[model samples]
Target chain A: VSPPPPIADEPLTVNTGIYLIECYSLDDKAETFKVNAFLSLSWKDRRLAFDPVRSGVRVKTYEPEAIWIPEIRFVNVENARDADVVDISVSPDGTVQYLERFSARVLSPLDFRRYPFDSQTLHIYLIVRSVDTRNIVLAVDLEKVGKNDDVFLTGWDIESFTAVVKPANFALEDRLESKLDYQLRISRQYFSYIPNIILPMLFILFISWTAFWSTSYEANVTLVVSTLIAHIAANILVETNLPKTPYMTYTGAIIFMIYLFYFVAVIEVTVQHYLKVESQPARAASITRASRIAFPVVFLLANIILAFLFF
Target chain B: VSPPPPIADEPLTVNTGIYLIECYSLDDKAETFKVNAFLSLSWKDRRLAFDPVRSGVRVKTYEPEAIWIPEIRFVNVENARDADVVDISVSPDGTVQYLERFSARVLSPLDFRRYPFDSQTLHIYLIVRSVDTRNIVLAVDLEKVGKNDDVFLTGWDIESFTAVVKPANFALEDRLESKLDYQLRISRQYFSYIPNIILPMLFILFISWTAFWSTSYEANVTLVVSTLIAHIAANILVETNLPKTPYMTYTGAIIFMIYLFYFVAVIEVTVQHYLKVESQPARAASITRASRIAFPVVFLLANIILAFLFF
Candidate 1:
């Protein structure tokens, strides 16, 4: 069967206005195409909102002019061992663009890198694309485009969030600069992009810290276990948002730090609990001091020494 | 400073079993050099081991004369990015290599994939050469590379087992017929590489299952929470052992499944606990019936769905 003719008047260029539309596409293998329609508006004015009349809540406009560049790179999948006809285009309304045919399949494994962290203007928008029937595209932003980010840094617990603007109209060279800047800015701003990273990490760490306050070994462990699970959930959620990076990422490192601290805290509590069980009062007091003071002092010393020597 | 008369053996060539290591100067950068080491091993012996002895363990050969060709790919990170005063050399002991003067700012991001999963006759190993600090190389043997494998997989919780191998000698080329076969082999054998993946997963799943026999909702949650922590620890361990891959890895997917099952269990217990407290015979009977039915149904449904979907 002939390939879907190159999308006609592809990538409708707009200076910024709203439009409503439905999109449909047929690939080489699939018959009846699926449809997804959404309203989109692009304006030079960075500020805009869609007031959902029913809910009375204003949906902030996803700023497009901030980083919108039109370019499309070939989608390549290392594992699939298959390439397909690909096309990515913006809708006439400028609200949503669709990458038609096997574009999603092709682009799924691509890695994208943006650069420059400060004052770098970047445009963020969402894409609604059709995925292979068996495959589910949870949220395919531009985050997954490159080699797994250095694995050690991102660790397995952290996820990445990315904004990809398919430059179907603009060439790769023109978009390269903005793309690099976008990558850097996103990497730096990622923590804020998802507040859960900071809040949950701190929450877990604080819970871990409470082991110092708890007198019972069981209580300390119970709290540590709960916090560990909380941290794990946060770790999983955050990791899903970001591309995997090598070594421990700042976020991942922080999470590990919390876990390690809890491990230490548990030991501290166990020691204290054992001291309280001692028969002699004087010996028990001495044991408590060693457990409470000496233990923390040594731990702090070890941590400091290691961090200084290693860092 | 005068550059030492370009070393006599300008391009050094070192030979080892099934591998050739070459070091050449970076033509553009003074004192900077790039080494390309390549190794070709037989496909019949598809397993290999590089149990670095410095890890303070008696090195035992799990598999001998396996066709696996693992290489250590090291980059002169310090000199590659800056001025050329870099010194790199192979140690007299074939196992150790060094890169001096360029030690501080090196980013050794090595790529480990050489071929696809199934038909591929070769597996590639990537290691980064470390400074002679006490940090020993940490890695599992090829036969024990996956989740269920007994050897390296057992060390998941021991975080200190994390080690780096020298990258300079890391290169391998393999001839594989079909990527699909390679992937299937990898998918099937990969679990065997790291034994902890399945162990912790099954252990936690079993732990969750035991929650069904708990006499009270509180008891069930206590067991579930502890099992969840075990699953989380296992997830971290499994993640640390393997390089990042697309989709939930067998190890990671198992952890996710464990938690997902735990989540359903939590909801069921919460509902059952609430119903039992309603203070009526009908309510108590309904709660008991619901608890019994829900536990098995949820467990079975979750297991069936996850089995069909994730694996």
Candidate 2:
């Protein structure tokens, strides 16, 4: 009914382990992820100690309400964790092992600087509030800390699930606290982006570049401005699907830069008209000829530069 | 161990159930899905019967090695299923119960007729191969043949997971086989396609229509041909991500339809140039005026017809 009384001045050490069962719904907009896992806790409770041979069982199971348990909580969880205690067993020497399967919506920030090309380390912070009778210090059991081989998150490759061995011991609200950090590292799957976003946007720019082959002002203006309208539509389409990140993304940079390319194309169209109207037909023709090569050169190199800057 | 002998020349009936724990990785191209679930099987085995009152246990647990279990397998699995036996228990009346947690990659065909707007019923066929000891048949326990509420497949809404109560009994290779059909109904998430594919493709077609406003052969040719080139690229982009299906998808119908619209726009451009070169200015102007309205009218109507036909 109460915390085990510590014989010495040292804080009670409670070992912790998390075995991830399922990882799902990595929500980009809310910066949250849903996880299903088994949280294991172990500590000494000598009050329940007994002789194994007399009991006829190596470990004795007890009802949770009939025994004392450390109050474990997730620090950065969205609401509270949903936990179901699976088992609690006590050994002859008085070591109590507890296991609970839980589902939690964890609040973890995501960096979209590289966006679909980005990688993230999602965190789950585990802590226990101490009681007046004793202080609890959390420790990790390396063998039990792991994830199921079948655990997966859609659109991401789960690289590793690891916990920092040492606990972060600190004082909070004038009370001693111990916390453990579990990290889930994941990298984005970038295949869909090439065909769906990047390649489609590139083809539109190529459509705009075709204006260099013409000399008529009216026709050239329609070519550039019509594609510009389509570009804006494409931009709106892209932004609607993504979260509102404060910093620009790699895809965002490429989208914004394409506007400059369109602007330059329109300027070339305008200057070409002016020269032809001034009766300098040869000058306009040479500029149009040179632009056919110059435009693609600038676009290819500028895209590479953006990629390098972000990567 | 071998299967229990049937009484009175009747075949042994093993009740089967499935409880899906996790469903993930619905592969569109491969038409496959991975599932993690608990499979339950129960039957009567007289040899294992016991007197629970004398044993002081109402039910006795047996290692899988100590008892006979029906060789339950997934009929449509890509490879042999990976299964781990969780428990085997026997009641005092000789009723044996078995549970195993398994992961399987199920090969289920997909219908791409509606494509991203489609719904699918993925199948998991549970079957048992009969042996010479006795012909065994399968039955479904409605109470146990259900899925977890937490089961989900990304990019889809999981509607239901249910098993057909009757088994399909057939003789193959002169041995009786009984199969149960487990269906997982799912519908696609269609939001991403509108912005990424549909609207962007439409904008390019609209860009082609701008040629109606130009009479110069060079500019009109550039506008129609360049946007036409981009349309081909978008088509290739769409095809690359999808499995090659024999029937046309709703999106595929729309893509192929846009090709005709571009073709007619070119024909209009040619007719317009011919009228102008013949010095019939008013005739050419009137046709261009009508086209700006006619092209959109036909396009909107045709797209609606395609939608009605597919949906």
Candidate 3:
């Protein structure tokens, strides 16, 4: 067989940096999140170099289309609301810089196993669209690119920022293109979830556990069933905010565990009521006191085990 | 701005068809599946038309690169294992047909609310690469495309086939480009799951219920705890096969219900045992007998409610 054709050897190195202005519109149903940001791309082309003294200018700005520039595309962008190359500047040392302001909705693979207590990594990839890695290379300036703390997300906190340069291997040939990936590690501000989800659930659990302290069977059963209904409603309310998947999450497991506790209380109320009807009020009283302590201990232990297994 | 330079009015219509040969690897974690298929794309160009009588031929075959063709890309392809343009044909009426056979791993968004009994729709979309709908339109010949029954997918049954023509709107402009979506609805063969997952879990639940018949508290508790461990192990076994998500699925709910039943049985044994210690053997026996009927009734009712809510 004849030797493979020689690949392009001159690698065009493109430098990329991003400053996240804000993130909004996180739609779990669509598996997409929107971001507004500023992106800076720079590259050096000796062919376009000019002496500063002769040109009488250290920097000159021009329209993007006036010069040849490395075309960088967001590989994961689902909807680009705006992508405007606002300005391009040329430096005396043959360096060219392109500034872009963009608002885009990007696809993100989210794992909600520990949702509300989960940390997510959002990725934005900049890749050379038409040119292969053999002809072009994309690099990330990690130190200069990140989120500004002056801006705050409603229910998320900026945890960390990471940038990586790697080969885009989606082509037939291995490493045919290059890409720069900017990853933002955002942790959920779980404090809000406490009031919206956890606190309400805890109150229901407390109400169900109160059955263990009551001697009236009808009252205990009514309280337990009511809490069960309320807890299930809360479970559904939480579910509506997330996409459907197969495995159970920490949130789901906790709810399931609470349901079990409620059922246990129901069973306890039945047993104690039967004992009272059989002229064994003393036995029923003792059992009720035992459960008042046993219920909380078991619930706490189950939670600790669940937390260890899931989170 | 300046009338926005009149958009291309004449839409280039391209016909597309696909035959799904087989589906092999399906990964829930990566949210992707793999398929092997044959694709045919055809379009008309009057400039290339010729009289069969003049050429003394009804058809002519050529290399794909020998002629200009619309660049159709698979929008959801993640890893293309193999993509080969095997042949191209030109008809007497200037219709060019390109045939390609490819094996690709494609992205699929899976909803697992009824996993192990869930039906999934796998989508493959073909769209023009650089040309917009104003200049090019992709169409589907639904009559000529479908899955091959001869190729059986493991753990899945081919349910139905659907194809539709729609706009691939990536830009801000609506319907600026066209795409043909090929959807294959595949239902999981739940028979295997029944044997592997359901039967085993039912056996554990049955064992837990057996506690009602036994008077030896230690024996009953031992059996209940053993079944609890086995049930938990089964829960984890099933979970490992699925992706983690925030919402509980039908399979997960069933498992959780069984867990609640098991916990109730444990609580019943504890209460009954405590009654015996308090010299209430007769009352304890009556309670056990009552639970023998109560547990099954509640379990069946809970399952009915769950089935109604989920399925």
Top candidate by lDDT: 2
Q: DockQ scores for all the models shown?
A: 0.01, 0.02, 0.02
lDDT of 2 at B28: 83
lDDT of 3 by residue, A1-311 (tens): 11112235456678888877556556666777777666878877655678879987677666566577776778898854466564576777768777666767889888889877888888888777434323666777664476644334434677776787565535435445677778888887665355335754675566466556556566466657766776776777678778887888888888788878887888889989999999998999898899989999998999999999985
Lowest lDDT 10-mer window, candidate 1 chain B? B175-184
Best by TM-score: 2
Compose the digit string of candidate 2's lDDT tens values, residues B1-311: 98898777788889988888567668788999887776889999998999977988787778688889888888999898777675577889899878766778999999999987899999999998789989889998887767645455645788988888889999999999999999999998776566455665665676577666556666777777777876886787678768998898988998899999889888889889998899997998899899989999998999899889998
Residue A69 in model 3: lDDT: 76
Alpha carbon RMSD to native, model 2: 12.2
For candidate 2, the lDDT comes to 0.81
Candidate 1 on A32-148: residue-level lDDT in tens? Answer: 211111111222212222335753532222223333433322223222221121112222232333221111121121122221111222122222222122111112233222212
In order, the Cα lDDT scores of the candidates are 0.34, 0.81, 0.70
What does candidate 1's lDDT look like per residue over B212-243, in tens digits? 55546556556766675666566555444444
Model 3 misplacement above 4 A: A1-116, A123-311, B1-9, B51-56, B130-134, B166-175
- For A134-209, candidate 2 gives per-residue lDDT tens digits of 6899999988899999998989999999999999887643346688999999999999989987787778888878
Displacement of residue A146 (Cα, Å) in model 2 is: 11
Model 1: residues >4 Å from true position, as ranges?
A1-225, A228-311, B1-195, B243-246, B281-311
Q: Candidate 3 residues B1-311, lDDT tens each?
A: 00011124556677888888888777765556788988888877656678888989899887765676675666555422377897788997777888888887666667888887788998886766222212666778776587787867677887876787565544311124456678888888888887888888888888888889998765775576667656656765675577555466788778766756765676677678668867899999998999999998998898899889988
Give the DockQ-based CAPRI class for model 3: incorrect
